[PDB]
Amino acid sequence: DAVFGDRVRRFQEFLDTFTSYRDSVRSIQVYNSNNAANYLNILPHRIIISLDDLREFDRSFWSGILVEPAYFIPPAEKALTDLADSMDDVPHPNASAVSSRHPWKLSFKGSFGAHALSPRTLTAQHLNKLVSVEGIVTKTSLVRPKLIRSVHYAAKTGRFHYRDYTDATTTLTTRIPTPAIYPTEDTEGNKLTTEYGYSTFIDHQRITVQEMPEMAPAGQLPRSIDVILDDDLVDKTKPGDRVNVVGVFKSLGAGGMNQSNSNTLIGFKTLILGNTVYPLHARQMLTDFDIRNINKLSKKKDIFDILSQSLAPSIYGHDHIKKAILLMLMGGVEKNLENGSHLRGDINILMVGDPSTAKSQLLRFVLNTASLAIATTGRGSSGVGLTAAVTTDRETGERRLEAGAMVLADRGVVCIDEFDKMTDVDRVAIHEVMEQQTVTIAKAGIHTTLNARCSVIAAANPVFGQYDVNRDPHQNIALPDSLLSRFDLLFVVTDDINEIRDRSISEHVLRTHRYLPPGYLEGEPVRERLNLSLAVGEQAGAKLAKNKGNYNGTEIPKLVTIPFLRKYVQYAKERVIPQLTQEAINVIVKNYTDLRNDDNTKKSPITARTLETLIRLATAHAKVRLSKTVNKVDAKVAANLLRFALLGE
């Protein structure tokens, strides 16, 4: 009754106290007005409030929101709509666009405390309470419009009628259900024609999110919960993306309480109405002093060695492997031509060696440090389901494609273990994809070409238990020559027995295992922790706190921390697109001719593809030093790396 008015005026006072949201509303209004009629982006009517300030202002209203949002959110959005209706000034409005009546629905950020849960932790006593759930997106539905309010007109009356429809999932508060029957007759019998272009329709999508497999109980499978979100943010993220969804967790449906039940063992239905979504990514922006640090470090003469040594400090040796990984993570630019079709842009690396030589560990490091990557094993995958799958939707009842392993990894990197142990048949999928970076599916009446420009790194062991140096390279590798010719670089690793290197690697590994997590004693095992204190998160240049990166002193040369390297590669992959010159061309052609006509034994045959690989590596090295042109030193270093990878020092 009057409690609605009291809550509305309390929220109005709160909005009057804090002047940031009014400035945001004025800015969004003026930006929309400017976009209207000046020679495509439109800002949606949504604003985010930090409930920490609300707690600092009124504890009762804060607790009312966090405990029973149903009786508190609608008054807040009504007050926001009234404030917007008072602030705005449009003396000359339109006709169809003025009837939107968007309530300016809200978003939240700040500390939640005991309401920041996990999909497994959700239980009965957390119902009807605003919560934030963390997880990974597993599948999504289709964006289908739904009706809200229909506009009707009759020729005789000249009065436009309107009828409003609300469903269980449309509003927080349960109201009397309304069927979708179109009113076609007036009270006096006048014929009513439905008026499209004046009615209200909003998008609808359903997504499902599951708990992360890493934080799961022993011997238990991950569990999932489903999320409904509409209007704005309707097509954000995708399957295979870490998300934090803030919304209201409520039950819906009779759940067999009526006569429709067949057994007494019936459970209700639970579902969360999402209010906002945030990307976790375990942040992705760069500051001004970050740019200063990047530039001043790139002006150094030895950036490439520092960055190569900065990858996986606990892996002894494999220097050129680290250099190749660095060049691969930020490979060359893609070239397209109106007549030359497509030219491949990235680099692929394949490794083969005897057991226990740190290939899987380096691959896991690449997976951890990459911006986007997917983990895959040869034996536990099937090529048909690795690219696209056909499944039926439960809601619509139709069948739609599901993205495969590497389609999710578009513009990323795919890492495969036990490559040689994979079934031969599935290999054709790779033969399809690595050829033209496009997978075509044609099955059950679906005809579509899916783009997949990912780079693939693989590690396989030779046919014998250990590599035979005295044998032909072809007979040591089980894979056929057709796919081996595509991979740019072939690396062979062996653990030659040598007492000096054995002692060095032994003391290094023993150094690694004597490590203690900071602030934790050695007498007890590693214990799990909770999430961050904030459900949603967010002097210059004089600190160099995490810039230099030399966290501990053990060698004269420098070392940089991983997050700054990720920032560097993010900056480089976007801000720089270099071009090549004739000076590097001379070196490239000269070294190609010298390598091709040396006429000595070599691990792998060469062809015109190797020169294209040299060009791509030269472009990648022109990117690594943040220059817009290719220097001949890049050609020299690429030639040296290729000669090592094909001959050996």
């Binding site: 169809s96 964006v143 419009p145 739904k146 009065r159 499209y196 004046y198 995708k238 009842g397 578009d410």
Partner: protein, 358 residues
């Protein structure tokens, strides 16, 4: 019951302006009079209305302080109602046939003439206009240079992708772009359904626009309205009016799909003389009306507010390229003359195929 709201749109002045434009427009005299005359002589079969003509006419007539509102904006915000208004206006001012007609072939008109010579002889039913209509109304989107001619942002066009269309665009006139993959066959669809009444005077008619149809059981014939039945009404295929129906779907281009996503689809309906104007496997940009379709056809008693949507075709540009079956033309004749003057040709053609490979 139903609360009422006020809108700045009143259809009487719009209809008067429509009639004035259709009668007075000068681009041969009036174009819109000549085309209607050709329709009257059973020569034309479809009507195309250029919104650029209306825009330029209103812009040039605004120089005198008489015009008060804009009509192309109302067309953009709503189309089907204006289609009904246009067909009413056209039927109101339909000209006289200035040419002879092979009048014996029109079986529908012969049947209606027989029905009239029955009913009006005894001193008659007002047949709905859509039964008697022979033409079809089609629209044409504006051109960007015409919009640039003036300050106003009357743009439209802008061939949105399939996924870029959202829920608030329902009812407007939009343009889509993509590749056609599936095209169904041609199947006749009903527009006006007529029932014979077993010699009981007038033959009752019925009109349905929904995709689901229900028949009659009893008729309003006076002797049939008597306290006992006189013959069971039957549907007559000859008297009723039909229309060609075809449906297709369009796929998003590989360029416009954001990374990590699967391309979506969009159904499209085409009726009238535009049937069979598109083939699978081509790039087109269709202009039409974006309309909702009820989900009740699936009959699941679910999706209380969720509904399906489809596009209604109005005008298509085939785009792409044409093989033309080497149809002879003067330009290619001088081209082959140039080739003949070029002398030995096969080595040049071999050189010209793939210069990328050496």
């Amino acid at each position: 019951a139903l609360p009422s709201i006020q809108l700045p749109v009143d259809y009487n002045n719009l209809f008067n302006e429509i009639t004035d434009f259709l009668v007075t427009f000068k681009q041969k005299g009036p174009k819109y009079m000549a085309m209607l005359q050709k329709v009257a002589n059973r020569e034309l079969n479809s009507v195309i209305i250029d919104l650029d003509d209306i825009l330029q006419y209103q812009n040039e007539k605004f120089l005198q302080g008489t015009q008060a509102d804009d009509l192309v904006s109302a067309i953009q915000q709503n189309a089907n109602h204006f289609t009904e208004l246009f067909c009413r206006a056209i039927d109101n001012n339909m000209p006289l046939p200035t040419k002879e007609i092979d009048y014996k072939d029109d079986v529908l008109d012969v049947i209606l003439n027989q029905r009239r010579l029955r009913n009006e002889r005894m001193l008659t039913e007002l047949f709905p206009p859509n039964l008697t209509r022979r033409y079809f109304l089609y629209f044409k989107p504006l051109s960007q240079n015409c919009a640039r001619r003036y300050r106003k942002k009357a743009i439209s066009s802008k061939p949105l992708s399939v996924r870029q269309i959202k829920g608030d665009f329902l009812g407007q006139l939009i343009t889509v772009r993509g590749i056609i993959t599936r095209v169904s066959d041609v199947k006749p669809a009903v527009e006006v359904i007529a029932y014979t009444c077993d010699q009981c005077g007038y033959e009752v008619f019925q009109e349905v626009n929904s995709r689901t149809f229900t028949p009659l059981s009893e008729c309003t014939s006076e002797e049939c309205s008597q306290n006992q039945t006189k013959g069971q009404l039957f549907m007559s295929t000859r008297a009723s009016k039909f229309s060609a129906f075809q449906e297709c779907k369009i796929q998003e281009l590989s360029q416009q799909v954001p990374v990590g996503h699967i391309p979506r689809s969009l159904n499209i309906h085409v009726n009238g003389t535009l049937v069979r104007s598109l083939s699978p496997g081509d790039i087109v940009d269709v202009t039409g009306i974006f309309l909702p379709a009820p989900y009740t056809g699936f009959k699941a008693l679910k999706a209380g507010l969720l509904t399906e949507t489809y596009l209604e075709a109005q005008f298509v540009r085939q785009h792409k390229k044409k093989f033309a079956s080497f149809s002879l033309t003067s330009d290619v004749e001088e081209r082959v003359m140039e080739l003949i003057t070029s002398g030995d040709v096969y080595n040049r053609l071999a050189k010209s195929i793939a210069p990328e490979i050496y």
